[PDB]
Design a protein around this ligand. Structure first.
Ligand SMILES: *[B]([O])([O])C1=[C]C2=C([C]=[C][C]=[C]2)S1
Length: 261
């Protein structure tokens, strides 16, 4: 079976809708499966918010160390890092780290608020040539992931292209690019997702996302030991609101598309 046939079969068994975009930076070849279809990003959108702040920091050398007050009222449904800092402050850098490496929702909301709202995150994506990404809501409602709802969505290909630009390419100045990569490499939430489908010693940076409709996502930059990087987006969503999330599908898709590298 071809890679396409394997992906189609995986989707068939899965009980959902699978979206994959792999970019092989050796030759810009791509493996695409529903790669132009929209999916709710869920926490994969945290990358765009953090990157928007990194972009601002290129022209404001004091920005990343700017204190942000964390109040009890700021806490939302998931605040593993921010809850430790209630009544204190976190810097914008610390909020970027928490949003990316722990998927902290308070951190995401502080980034969005700092930027001036979801529409400003969209404008940042557009400035990178991403015509597809849209952020519409804050946490936690941006994760409703209702089938057919365009809010807080992108496509696998758009997000793969933008993640490539952000981490390996032209989007950010070097220090900021390196910081984003450091953050992604230190992610703590992705063990069972794309990473689980790859050779154990490959270096990976990723951001997971999950939401309602069993929406289960991961976006990754992958550095093989003897090959150019790969950029991989695996998005997955299901028809029923209370579907279980399925990181195993993402691992399986990653294994299918990285065979041979
Ligand atoms: B993200 O990782 O997709 C997240 C979304 C929510 C989290 C916690 C609570 C509610 C939504 S993490």
């Amino acid at each position: 079976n071809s890679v396409q046939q394997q992906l189609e079969a995986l989707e068939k068994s899965s009980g959902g809708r699978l979206g994959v975009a792999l970019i092989n930076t050796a030759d810009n070849s791509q493996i695409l499966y529903r790669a132009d279809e929209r999916f709710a990003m869920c926490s994969t959108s945290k990358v765009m918010a953090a990157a928007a702040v990194l972009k601002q920091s290129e022209s404001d050398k004091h920005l990343l160390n700017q204190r942000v007050e964390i109040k009890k009222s700021d806490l939302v449904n998931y605040n593993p890092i921010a809850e430790k800092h209630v009544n204190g402050t976190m810097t914008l850098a610390e909020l970027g780290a928490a949003a990316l490496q722990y998927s902290d929702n308070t951190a995401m909301n502080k980034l969005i608020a700092h930027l001036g709202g979801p529409d400003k995150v969209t404008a940042f994506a557009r400035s990178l040539g991403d015509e597809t990404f849209r952020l519409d809501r804050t946490e936690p409602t941006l994760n409703t992931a209702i089938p057919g709802d365009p809010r807080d969505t992108t496509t696998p290909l758009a997000m793969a292209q933008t993640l490539k630009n952000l981490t390996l390419g032209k989007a950010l100045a070097e220090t900021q690019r390196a910081q984003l990569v450091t953050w992604l490499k230190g992610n703590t939430t992705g063990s069972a997702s794309i990473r689980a489908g790859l050779p154990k010693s490959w270096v990976v940076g990723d951001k997971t996302g999950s939401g309602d409709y069993g929406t289960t996502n991961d976006i990754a930059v992958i550095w093989p030991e003897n090959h150019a990087p790969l950029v991989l987006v695996t998005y997955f969503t299901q028809p029923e609101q209370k579907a279980e999330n399925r990181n195993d599908i993402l691992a399986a898709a990653a294994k299918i598309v990285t065979h041979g590298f």
